[model samples]
Target: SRNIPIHSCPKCGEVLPDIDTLQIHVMDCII
Candidate 1:
């Protein structure tokens, strides 16, 4: 199974609106 329009953070356990937002938060999330 896959979440097409859903994006979640494995590091911080947060959900973003889309992959675009996911990348943005990833920077901060990875920090």
Candidate 2:
């Protein structure tokens, strides 16, 4: 798995403060 920054959002253009939180959101979102 790729290591992403906590301040970067892998989904949208929004930035997240927590890395785990962003990961969870990405899991729920499907392309």
Candidate 3:
């Protein structure tokens, strides 16, 4: 099994499972 890093969005306080998803989420949250 592999371990993934967790990221949180400062704008929305949303938990993102991956870095790519975190980037997309931040962009969407900004716009």
Estimate, for each residue in 1-31, the C-alpha lDDT of model 3 and write its tens digit. 9977699998868999888999888888974
By lDDT rank, best first, the candidates go 3, 1, 2
True lDDT of residue 10, candidate 1: 91
**How many collisions between residues are there in candidate 2?**
0
Q: Which stretches of candidate 2 lie above 4 Å from their native place?
A: 1-6
TM-score of 2: 0.41
Candidate 3 backbone overlaps, count: 0
lDDT of candidates 1 onward, in order: 0.85, 0.67, 0.86
For candidate 2, the per-residue lDDT at 22 reads: 73
Compared with the true structure, the alpha-carbon lDDT of candidate 2 equals 0.67
Q: Candidate 2 on 1-31: residue-level lDDT in tens? A: 9985566655675566787767776777665
Worst 10 residues of 1 by lDDT: 22-31
lDDT of candidate 1 at residue 1, scale 0 to 100: 94
From the highest TM-score down, the ranking of the candidates is: 3, 1, 2
Off by over 4 Å in 1: 1-4
